[PDB]
Structures are given as C-alpha cells and as structure tokens.
Amino acid sequence: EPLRVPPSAPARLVVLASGTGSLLRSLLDAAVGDYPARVVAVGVDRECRAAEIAAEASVPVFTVRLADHPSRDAWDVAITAATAAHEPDLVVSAGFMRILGPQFLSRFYGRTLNTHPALLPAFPGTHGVADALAYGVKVTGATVHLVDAGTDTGPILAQQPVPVLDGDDEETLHERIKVTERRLLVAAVAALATHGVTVVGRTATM
Amino acid sequence: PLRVPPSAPARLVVLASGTGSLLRSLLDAAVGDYPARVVAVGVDRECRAAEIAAEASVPVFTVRLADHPSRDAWDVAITAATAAHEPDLVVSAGFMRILGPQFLSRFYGRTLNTHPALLPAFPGTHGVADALAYGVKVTGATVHLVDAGTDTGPILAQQPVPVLDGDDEETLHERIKVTERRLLVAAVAALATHGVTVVGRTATM
Ligand SMILES: CN1c2c(O)nc(N)nc2NC[C@H]1CNc1ccc(C(=O)N[C@@H](CCC(=O)O)C(=O)O)cc1
Ligand SMILES: [Cl-]
Ligand SMILES: [Cl-]
Numbered sequence: 001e002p003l004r005v006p007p008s009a010p011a012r013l014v015v016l017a018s019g020t021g022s023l024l025r026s027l028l029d030a031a032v033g034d035y036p037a038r039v040v041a042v043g044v045d046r047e048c049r050a051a052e053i054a055a056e057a058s059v060p061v062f063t064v065r066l067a068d069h070p071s072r073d074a075w076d077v078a079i080t081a082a083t084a085a086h087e088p089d090l091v092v093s094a095g096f097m098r099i100l101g102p103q104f105l106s107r108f109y110g111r112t113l114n115t116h117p118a119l120l121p122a123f124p125g126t127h128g129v130a131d132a133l134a135y136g137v138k139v140t141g142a143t144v145h146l147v148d149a150g151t152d153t154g155p156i157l158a159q160q161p162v163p164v165l166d167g168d169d170e171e172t173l174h175e176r177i178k179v180t181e182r183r184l185l186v187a188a189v190a191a192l193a194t195h196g197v198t199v200v201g202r203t204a205t206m
Numbered sequence: 207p208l209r210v211p212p213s214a215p216a217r218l219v220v221l222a223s224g225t226g227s228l229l230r231s232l233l234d235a236a237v238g239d240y241p242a243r244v245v246a247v248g249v250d251r252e253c254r255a256a257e258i259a260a261e262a263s264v265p266v267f268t269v270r271l272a273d274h275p276s277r278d279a280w281d282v283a284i285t286a287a288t289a290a291h292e293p294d295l296v297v298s299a300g301f302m303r304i305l306g307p308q309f310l311s312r313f314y315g316r317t318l319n320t321h322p323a324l325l326p327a328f329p330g331t332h333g334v335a336d337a338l339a340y341g342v343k344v345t346g347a348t349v350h351l352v353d354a355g356t357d358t359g360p361i362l363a364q365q366p367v368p369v370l371d372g373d374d375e376e377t378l379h380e381r382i383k384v385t386e387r388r389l390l391v392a393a394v395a396a397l398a399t400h401g402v403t404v405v406g407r408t409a410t411m
C-alpha cells in the first residue's frame with residue numbers, strides 16, 4: 001500500500017549534479033538559519049561548475065565516474081554507496097545527467113527529487129520550454145517531483161503555473177520559468193523535511 | 207526497457223578502420239550549436255580515417271588486433287582505450303571489427319553504426335553488392351545501435367535511396383554514402399539531445 005517517508009527536520013541533504021550548479025546555488029542560499037535542512041555533500045560524475053560552487057561553500061564533493069566502473073549496473077552500485085555514506089534524508093538531482101538505477105532507487109525512492117520547467121505530464125524531455133512555446137499554450141509552469149524509474153515520471157510534489165507572454169522567446173520564457181522553479185524546489189525541500197510525504201498510487205501528499 | 211539519458215553537449219569517440227568519410231562529416235558538423243564534440247578517434251590499423259582525425263587535431267588511439275594475445279584481450283584493451291576518453295557516445299564509422307562482449311558490457315546503448323542498406327535487408331559488410339545482386343529498386347541507409355556480434359540493435363533512423371538501371375557497386379555505394387552522412391550527423395545530434403528509449407526492438411529519441 002502507501003509509502004510513508006517520515007519528517008526529517010533538520011534534514012541532511014545531498015545534491016547530485018553534473019552541470020551549472022544554479023539550482024545548487026539556490027539551495028545553498030536558502031539553507032541558513034531556521035531552514036530545516038543543510039547541504040551535507042554534493043555528488044558529481046565529472047568536473048563541473050556545480051563541484052566548484054560546492055567546494056567554495058565548504059561542502060564535501062564526492063565523484064563517481066561511469067568510466068571508473070565496469071558497466072552501468074556497477075556504476076549504479078557505486079553511486080548508491082557513495083551517496084549512502086552521507087546518510088541523506090533527501091537527495092536533489094540538480095542538473096544530474098545519469099539515470100539513477102534500480103539500486104539507487106531501491107535505497108532512496110521517496111527521498112529523491114527533481115525539478116522540471118513545464119507542468120508535467122505535459123512537455124517532458126529536454127526541450128520542455130521550447131516545446132510549450134511551439135505548441136502555443138498560454139500557461140506552462142514548473143514541477144517538483146519524486147524521481148522514479150522513468151525520467152520525468154515520478155509522483156508530483158508541487159507545481160506552480162507561469163504565463164506565456166505574446167512574443168516570448170525560449171530564453172525569456174525559460175528565465176521566467178526558472179524564477180518559479182527555484183522557489184518551488186526550495187519550498188518543496190523544506191516541506192518534505194518538515195512533514196515528510198505519503199504516496200498512494202501516484203499521488204504524493206506532504 | 208533500455209533508457210539512455212540525454213548527454214548534450216556530448217563527448218563522441220568515433221571508431222574507424224578505412225576511408226574516414228563518415229568521420230569527416232562528423233568532424234565538420236560537430237561545432238557550435240551541434241550538441242556534441244568529437245573527443246577522440248580509435249582505429250585498429252593505420253588508415254585515412256586516422257590521418258583525417260590528426261588533420262583536425264583530434265587525439266587518435268590505435269588498438270591493433272595483432273598486438274594482443276587473443277581476440278578477448280584486444281576487446282578488453284579497446285574498451286579501456288575508449289573508456290579513457292570518457293565518451294557519451296561511440297560511433298562506429300567504417301570500423302571493421304566486431305565489437306566484443308567486454309566493449310558492449312560497457313557501451314551497449316551508447317554505441318551506434320551506419321549501415322548502407324535498410325535493415326533487416328542486406329546486413330553484413332557487402333550490403334551494397336548484395337542489394338545490387340538481389341535487384342531491389344529501393345535500398346537505403348540505417349543508423350542503428352550496435353549489439354552482440356552479428357545482431358542488429360534497435361534502429362534509430364533510416365532513409366531510402368533508389369537503385370537506378372545500370373548502377374554498379376560503386377555508383378550505388380556513392381549515392382548511399384551521401385544519405386549515410388546526413389543521416390548519421392542527424393542521428394548523433396538527436397541521440398545527444400534526447401537520449402533514447404527502447405520498447406521491444408523499437409527505439410525512440
Ligand atoms: C532527474 N532525472 C532522472 C529521473 O527522472 N529518473 C531517474 N531514474 N534518474 C534520473 N537522473 C537524472 C534525470 C534524468 N536524466 C537526464 C539527463 C540529462 C538531462 C539534460 O541534460 N537536461 C538539460 C535540460 C532539459 C531538462 O530540463 O531536463 C540540461 O539542462 O542539462 C535531463 C535528464
Ligand atoms: Cl499563469
Ligand atoms: Cl527511393
């Protein structure tokens with residue numbers, strides 16, 4: 001039946017990343033004072049700006065490279081162990097570019113989240129903003145959701161709409177979506193720490 | 207259900223054994239907004255593909271079959287020589303050896319090839335001579351994922367090419383390479399941008 005993830009405040013948070021680190025930056029700025037989590041480590045699979053931002057904020061960085069393990073299954077086993085060594089309560093995938101495998105999700109399903117710049121299940125994939133623009137919707141949005149076995153498929157945690165303006169291009173639309181995407185992620189992490197989450201079918205309530 | 211994630215901007219290693227014409231189409235395309243870069247070329251022999259790779263200042267590694275004690279040993283060594291460049295995609299571009307189970311155990315799902323016939327018709331190394339001898343009126347090119355030995359992995363992209371009266375092997379092969387070059391460059395970009403999902407034998411990007 002249901003999956004219950006208990007409250008965890010003050011939460012130990014692990015961010016997984018491969019890219020720019022801007023969501024990472026958004027989470028480091030917010031996790032101060034009474035914010036009910038702290039970033040305890042950043043995991044990357046390659047040298048990247050996110051690793052740099054993490055080190056500059058005195059956050060431990062662990063690296064697990066696909067090229068150092070004999071296959072995808074063994075990499076899944078190793079990322080899982082390197083992440084567990086930090087005992088997180090929550091894992092944010094923030095620009096991470098590897099699919100999290102069966103072993104990782106066996107351990108961290110319910111506690112792992114991702115953000116997407118459309119109102120899932122509309123516009124999944126890497127071109128969510130450009131697609132929403134080509135499709136001619138007037139309303140798009142940002143989604144935070146639990147990571148499951150598929151990509152963009154997990155139980156939804158929080159959503160907020162964002163208008164498409166006349167004459168918007170991709171860039172101007174994307175930046176508008178990113179403003180909301182950042183707040184939504186920050187609020188979702190706090191809420192999961194404070195209240196935990198229950199999942200019935202595919203529906204996630206705090 | 208095989209799922210390979212997007213990798214743009216992707217690190218490409220191209221493996222080659224011959225002319226380097228497919229390779230050159232990739233080198234020329236893979237700049238700017240193209241969602242990938244060629245980071246290394248691997249060859250199992252001296253060939254024009256390796257020379258073309260040095261002209262564009264791309265590192266070349268060479269793993270010759272004769273330099274190892276067994277087909278198995280060669281397979282381990284080429285896999286390691288490739289993994290060293292941390293590729294996101296491995297493109298087989300006139301590469302003349304079966305890629306072994308060790309290579310596929312690391313790279314299956316991320317390895318692709320262009321074949322000058324419309325698979326499953328005319329597989330193997332003489333797909334063009336075979337298509338001609340059979341007397342088909344429509345042949346083509348197929349970009350597909352590479353799998354175990356002779357087997358054809360999920361088809362990524364295909365495009366047809368007419369056989370014309372009086373064609374010989376050469377003119378027909380030249381017509382198909384024109385389509386191969388475009389199709390490969392388009393498929394690498396799509397694979398890099400979108401990744402791939404496989405249901406049954408069917409691949410979607
Ligand atoms: C979060 N998501 C995910 C998932 O949903 N489920 C599993 N099991 N594992 C994972 N791991 C990470 C991710 C799936 N893979 C990827 C990998 C790469 C991209 C990608 O490069 N996206 C582009 C922008 C497009 C986007 O918003 O996805 C980028 O900003 O980098 C997008 C998704
Ligand atoms: Cl709105
Ligand atoms: Cl035709």
Ligand SMILES: [Mg+2]
Pocket residue numbers: 114115116117
């Ligand atoms: Mg995303």
